[PDB]
Ligand binder design. Structure first.
Ligand SMILES: Cc1cn([C@H]2C[C@H](O)[C@@H](COP(=O)(O)OP(=O)(O)O[C@H]3O[C@@H](C)[C@H](O)[C@@H](O)[C@H]3O)O2)c(=O)[nH]c1=O
Ligand SMILES: Cc1cn([C@H]2C[C@H](O)[C@@H](COP(=O)(O)OP(=O)(O)O[C@H]3O[C@@H](C)[C@H](O)[C@@H](O)[C@H]3O)O2)c(=O)[nH]c1=O
Ligand SMILES: [Cl-]
Ligand SMILES: [Mg+2]
Ligand SMILES: [Mg+2]
Ligand SMILES: [Mg+2]
Lengths: 601, 599
């Protein structure tokens, strides 16, 4: 009885990525006799198929099959699905990895709620978020929210196999199309799939590694295809209007902003006319009535054919952002506290302004463009209460991103001079690092802090920064922690000495080093460090006689102790016979200090 | 004819291309060549520098070339060239520098009219936003009345009355370990009563930037301070040199220098600095200093290196970057409104803190208790802020203060008892103020701002975040203020970088083609037109459709009148029919408007 079948379409697969894929399957906590691997090679011209069979030699649950080159992964995915026999199917691409507890957590969640689709938290290499809104909390009855529950609509979810077969849900083979996973997930929801969102554990790592669509005529052929599919197949009004709104905003209106400043005039004219024709033919007017002000402006000028005004608006909007600065950062008890501030600016320089005229707060525009727009489309008066300001964290090893919960933030619209108003935010939050340590590997990792600011239609998710020097250490319940300004001026948090030495960053009270030569113990107290709870981290140290340049290191035991709000390194000389002056270098958790410690024995 | 100027150049393995540029800068001098002489002394070059100098000497009757045995530096060849010179004034020109075209005439006339022993002419350096910001601000033919400060910066690149140097036996030190020999040279000129003039309105000398032992360094520093104390007689002059050099070279290692050096060199130089302060620097000197330097003086004498290192980490990154709040052309000038604020690395605000009626430097308690209360109390310094604009010619490297600005600096309660420092400024650029040589008419100009307060000095390029491109045609000057690729404010005049047609845009539907005269008129879209302007150019035509177009060059013309600008293109002997590509080329800059016209 197989719980999970992993479908992997391969073609000229990079072997190192394939090794990492197979490794992440083997590390699954689930019993290997409870899942199967179904590999279908899509006519790889390299030696991937022979390597795939080689992997299957020592794995009885792995099936490999060769097919004539299909061109994409839709054909091999369908073939593997028909020959799969597991209760749930994960479509895993040949260059991605799975987290070690995914199979168990996803299946238990799925079986307990009789789900047809488990949308588990997906992780990407780049960016400060992925599925920020959808992966916010676990939802076993996610389909009640509508078709939005399946976003982001990647195929890297777990689908009940019997549900796919029963409604004949397959990938578009013999049809090269764009966003085939949008089609796939839409058909699943159209057929009434019971959807569950598993948000408290990263399940899939979609890795960035580095042709179809590039061409503007092919791209807008696929876009007309996607929108017609929405209009022809989605029968729920709420679901149809969400998909129309979401894809009109992101892919159609999405070229009428900064995209205009990064393309040549030939491509702009070609894609602008496609967008105007698609808006008129497929997008009802009520769709834009529920868009933000700046998108309503873009939709109005698009349907007027006013590309020149859109190009001008893009120059005006170029650079609007919200960067956060650290106002204060310190450890308290078992947590790290932050106070941050931000304000809307151009490129983190001069303030971004809105302007008050009579009883309206208006976007600042030249008179030439305001006279072409409906009065309400540049009146922000009703949107001044919709700002959000939140902190987030990202593990530099795992690439997993999380919102930091419990934050307190406020955003004010402030009159700076005359009738000009700026937008200022202040926030305070704390990090409890255990909230984000889910696999053992997470305990030794650098973490990078960011902030997410939204308002007036703009989204700015950027790394937290600070100007002044910042290095602060903590020893909290056996966790070495170092918050610091990194080389890019951004805020990082080393936990477990993955990048920095806590002894080096804390300093040493060299005049307070104690040598008990009868007990053979050298006590090295740490200078500046926040100590909470009891800690004992075992490590080692190295002694070298001063002067003897090429002397062998004398390896000895050492342990970083946190006790009664103070920290120290105890070095144990053991059975070594020592006389004279020695260089002492501590090695806690793989990081050596640079404190130039010398002791006389 | 009397020799007005002797140019003293000590050469040693001179870089050939710079030697050519040096020769050219002297040949281009507006002074008649029979009124100056070139006195070159080669310090035993291992390259063929002496051979090249003689190839110059063949075609130059006023050029003297001599080779001595290597002395290790330019001091001895300078002194030898000085005692064999015949001119009234001597300039010490290094073998890798150049002189501006009108320097000899302006300097000599200024020195001869005012009977000056030393003419300190405005010097220009490759890097930085100022040089001699204070001293080179105004012309002063009686500058020695202000004291020995009138000769700062004390480079040797001034003009000295030859007989004055010879009468007082003023020479450069040529010893085994020579450092700051120009400081001694200039100081000696002042001690012997030199009449000094500052020529500030014309760049005279380009000091070009081209491609360590702590024990020796502090030996030289002790030598320099002892020279000050033993030879300077006027107390005002002695106090100035002691203050200036104590601040810059002794206390000057007690800030950010501590973060750029290893602990061994720090301990050597700190102990040297502490001995020098104790032995040579009287206590009243530091009473003349700003609060932060009084902290440094106090902790130095206390031997408290650890507090100084911690203060350096607290101070690191303090700056004041200016943002453009408004920029526009009005009449014949370009106007700016800017804002600034003291920050750490243009991020979070720099703060001071109010306790009782004191405005205190924010410091850890451990340091505050080790310091006299007055030294971290900014209360009496909160109106000592300066905030002014400057400009730099990117080709000449010359920097100037922009005059006429209005500014205001405020100490603002941000929250609680924390106060930030905010400035605002209005100024305008009259580009005529800075065009002195013909080359200056076609040049990119870079704008900067100078902020000082609480001990800090921040002179940084003006910046803007939003896209800024504005063009103007003002009395035959094409002017484009723009956010350059580094995000800083630049002013291109004469089309040295950008095309004013491309940045102004063209009203494609107002193009007027006239077959009778063959005059294609292309009006410009957005541009500030003031006065009348007429600039010659040319255009290129290509049949739209033909692969290798084999272009047709025709004469074009950019014109401005009645607050309007247009480009008139003349095809003359026309041989054209159908759609034809047209791109203009004004002042070597061609637009990218993709103009198509069908004739
Ligand atoms: C080119 C090609 C790929 N494939 C397989 C390899 C992978 O497992 C899978 C996807 O290719 P990758 O390089 O991993 O893609 P990718 O890393 O860019 O990932 C994404 O690409 C988007 C375009 C898809 O819509 C998404 O579903 C997702 O797969 O297709 C074949 O089977 N045959 C082929 O001929
Ligand atoms: C090395 C050497 C140089 N010289 C000459 C070459 C130059 O004309 C002159 C100055 O050297 P430059 O390479 O131009 O250095 P430089 O470009 O660093 O110039 C400066 O150097 C500082 C140390 C001085 O204090 C300054 O007054 C200034 O001269 O010395 C000799 O005559 N003999 C030598 O052995
Ligand atoms: Cl530039
Ligand atoms: Mg992939
Ligand atoms: Mg030089
Ligand atoms: Mg800033």
């Amino acid at each position: 009885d197989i719980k999970i079948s992993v479908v992997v379409p391969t073609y000229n697969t990079e072997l190192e990525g394939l090794k990492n894929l197979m490794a992440s399957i083997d590390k699954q906590t689930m019993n290997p006799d409870e899942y199967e691997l179904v590999f279908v090679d899509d006519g790889s011209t390299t030696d991937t198929y022979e390597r795939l069979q080689e992997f299957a030699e020592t794995r009885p649950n792995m099936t490999v099959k060769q097919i004539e080159n299909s061109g994409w992964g839709s054909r091999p995915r369908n073939i593997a699905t028909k020959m799969a026999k597991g209760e749930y199917i994960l479509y895993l691409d040949h260059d991605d990895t799975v987290f070690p507890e995914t199979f168990e957590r996803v299946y238990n969640f799925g079986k307990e709620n009789n789900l047809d689709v488990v949308s588990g938290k997906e992780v990407r290499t780049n960016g400060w978020s992925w599925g920020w809104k959808q992966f916010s909390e676990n939802n076993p009855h996610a389909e009640e929210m509508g078709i939005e529950c399946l976003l982001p609509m990647t195929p890297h979810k777990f689908y009940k196999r019997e549900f796919l077969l029963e409604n004949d849900i397959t990938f578009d083979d013999g049809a090269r199309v764009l966003w085939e996973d949008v089609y796939f997930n839409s058909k699943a929801f159209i057929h009434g799939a019971k959807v569950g969102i598993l948000a408290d554990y990263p399940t899939y790592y979609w890795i960035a590694t580095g042709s179809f669509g590039r061409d503007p005529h092919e791209k807008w052929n696929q876009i007309n295809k996607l929108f017609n599919f929405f209009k022809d197949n989605i029968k729920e009004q709420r679901d149809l209007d969400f998909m129309l709104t979401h894809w009109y905003r992101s892919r159609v209106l999405g070229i009428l902003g900064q995209w205009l400043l990064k393309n040549n005039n030939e491509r702009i004219d070609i894609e602008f006319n496609y967008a105007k024709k698609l808006a008129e033919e497929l997008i009802p007017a009520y769709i834009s009535e529920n868009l933000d002000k700046n998108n309503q402006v873009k939709d109005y000028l698009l349907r007027q054919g006013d590309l020149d005004s859109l190009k001008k608006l893009a120059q005006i909007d170029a650079g609007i952002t919200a960067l956060s600065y650290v106002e204060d950062a310190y450890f308290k008890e078992d947590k790290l506290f932050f106070k941050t501030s931000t304000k809307m600016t151009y490129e983190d320089k001069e303030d971004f302004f809105i302007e008050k005229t009579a009883d309206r707060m208006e976007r600042i525009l030249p008179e030439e463009i305001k006279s072409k727009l409906p009065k309400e489309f540049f009146d922000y008066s009703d949107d001044l209460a919709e700002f959000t300001y939140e902190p987030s964290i990202k593990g530099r090893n795992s690439r997993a991103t999380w919102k930091i919960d419990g934050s307190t933030s406020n955003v004010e619209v402030v009159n700076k001079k005359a009738n000009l108003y700026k937008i200022e935010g202040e926030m305070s939050f704390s990090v409890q690092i255990n909230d984000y340590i889910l696999d053992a590997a997470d305990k030794k990792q650098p973490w990078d802090i960011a902030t997410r600011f939204t308002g007036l239609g703009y989204t700015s998710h950027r790394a937290l920064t600070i100007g002044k020097i910042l290095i602060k250490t903590a020893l909290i319940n056996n966790k070495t922690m170092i918050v610091y300004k990194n080389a890019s001026g951004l805020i990082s948090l080393d936990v477990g000495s993955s990048v920095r030495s806590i002894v080096e960053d804390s300093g040493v009270k060299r005049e307070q080093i104690l040598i008990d030569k009868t007990s053979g113990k050298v006590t090295i107290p740490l200078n500046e460090i926040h100590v909470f709870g009891e800690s004992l981290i075992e490590g080692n140290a190295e002694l070298k006689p001063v002067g003897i340049s090429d002397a062998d290191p004398i390896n000895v035991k050492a342990k970083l102790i946190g006790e009664a709000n103070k920290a120290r390194v105890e070095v144990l000389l053991g059975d070594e016979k020592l006389s004279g002056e020695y260089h002492l270098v501590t090695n806690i958790q793989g990081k050596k200090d640079k404190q130039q410690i010398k002791i006389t024995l």
